[PDB]
Ligand SMILES: Cc1c2c(c(O)c3c(O)cccc13)C(=O)[C@]1(O)C(=O)C(C(N)=O)=C(O)[C@@H](N(C)C)[C@@H]1C2
Ligand SMILES: Cc1c2c(c(O)c3c(O)cccc13)C(=O)[C@]1(O)C(=O)C(C(N)=O)=C(O)[C@@H](N(C)C)[C@@H]1C2
Ligand SMILES: [Cl-]
Ligand SMILES: [Cl-]
């Protein structure tokens with residue numbers, strides 16, 4: 530079928546959604562596209578290049594809150610951004626795994642620059658703004674990964690529980706992870722705020 | 733060589749450290765142990781079972797701060813716990829990936845029960861204590877994953893940067909991730925504290 534970037538990525542995303550990140554091999558991608566491997570190699574040199582581009586396209590397709598609204602507070606922006614990031618990562622199987630370790634793509638420069646600039650405009654040093662942004666990303670990535678990967682293990686295989694753990698597992702099995710995610714997100718945001726407002730005060 | 737649980741795990745950990753989580757196949761494990769695949773299958777039925785046990789053994793070997801000291805504050809415990817968790821996950825290549833999605837093992841029941849009990853004793857509901865513990869784990873897992881996975885991509889492949897992003901990348905390349913990790917950890921902890929102390933107050 531068609532082998533422009535867009536179609537190669539479409540097909541890769543589809544494949545990722547079926548077989549997960551393990552199953553995203555160049556041989557399997559070639560199979561899905563209906564082509565021979567040297568044909569694919571002309572367009573896609575290895576798994577790594579594919580993963581970088583998938584990371585970018587996942588956000589381009591489904592990350593709709595990349596930018597602060599007019600007059601939006603930094604707290605509100607971080608909140609909306611994190612929820613959108615989460616939604617995008619959950620869209621595809623192992624999407625958070627795909628996103629891991631990446632750096633902003635040229636196509637993401639203006640977006641991430643605006644994010645960073647906006648933090649500094651709200652009183653953060655570049656460093657402290659970056660630390661807050663990173664912590665939000667890491668927390669969100671960790672939550673999504675444990676949610677997605679837990680689900681992959683339940684279909685892989687299936688008491689003596691002490692009571693608090695028994696109940697803690699009941700709490701976790703009664704929700705997809707969103708409740709605990711949103712709770713931790715508020716904690717994290719308020720903590721940045723305490724830090725930011727403290728200035729040079731011991732806090 | 734010897735095929736008790738301990739030796740199988742030793743060898744798997746070694747293999748993981750060399751080839752990462754992709755390279756941890758039962759065929760390669762058999763090769764390292766010097767055995768045929770049906771021999772290995774008797775001891776290890778699939779990759780999933782191997783991963784669960786590796787998650788457990790990584791913490792057993794290198795997670796030394798699983799339990800609160802006598803009279804230790806919950807804040808201090810969470811801090812020390814998170815640092816220890818991080819250190820354990822960084823010990824092996826893709827260790828954080830190995831740990832993802834798991835649930836406490838029977839061998840971890842008493843430990844995690846004590847953690848949960850200790851939070852409740854310090855004023856948290858079981859739910860809120862769990863939410864704090866989870867957020868710490870997720871944040872820590874996310875940070876380690878992006879640190880480890882970033883490093884794997886630098887050896888996989890190698891300007892037009894706007895200034896804030898340029899500098900943000902300089903900041904990130906000048907440290908292994910620990911500084912930003914420890915900064916986010918304090919934010920997260922203080923946020924739990926604001927939540928906890930607020931009780932029924934609007935906060
Ligand atoms: C500022 C920044 C960000 C990210 C990032 O990886 C990064 C980096 O690797 C080095 C220096 C700065 C950054 C994000 O991944 C990203 O997910 C992202 O690309 C991004 C985006 N493209 O919209 C975001 O929404 C941000 N958000 C999840 C906090 C975050 C912003
Ligand atoms: C309480 C709890 C924990 C963990 C966990 O996975 C979990 C769960 O899946 C369901 C319900 C409760 C828990 C941890 O993974 C673990 O990493 C862990 O096993 C653990 C340990 N074994 O010592 C920890 O140190 C904890 N810490 C990283 C916050 C955390 C505690
Ligand atoms: Cl074409
Ligand atoms: Cl295209």
Ligand SMILES: [Cl-]
Nearest residue numbers: 600601602605
């Ligand atoms: Cl606002």
Ligand SMILES: [Cl-]
Nearest residue numbers: 733734735736
């Ligand atoms: Cl033996």
Ligand SMILES: [Cl-]
Nearest residue numbers: 736737738739
């Ligand atoms: Cl043994």
Ligand SMILES: [Cl-]
Nearest residue numbers: 803804805808
């Ligand atoms: Cl203390």
Ligand SMILES: [Mg+2]
Nearest residue numbers: 630631632666
């Ligand atoms: Mg990133």
Ligand SMILES: [Mg+2]
Nearest residue numbers: 833834835869
């Ligand atoms: Mg866990």
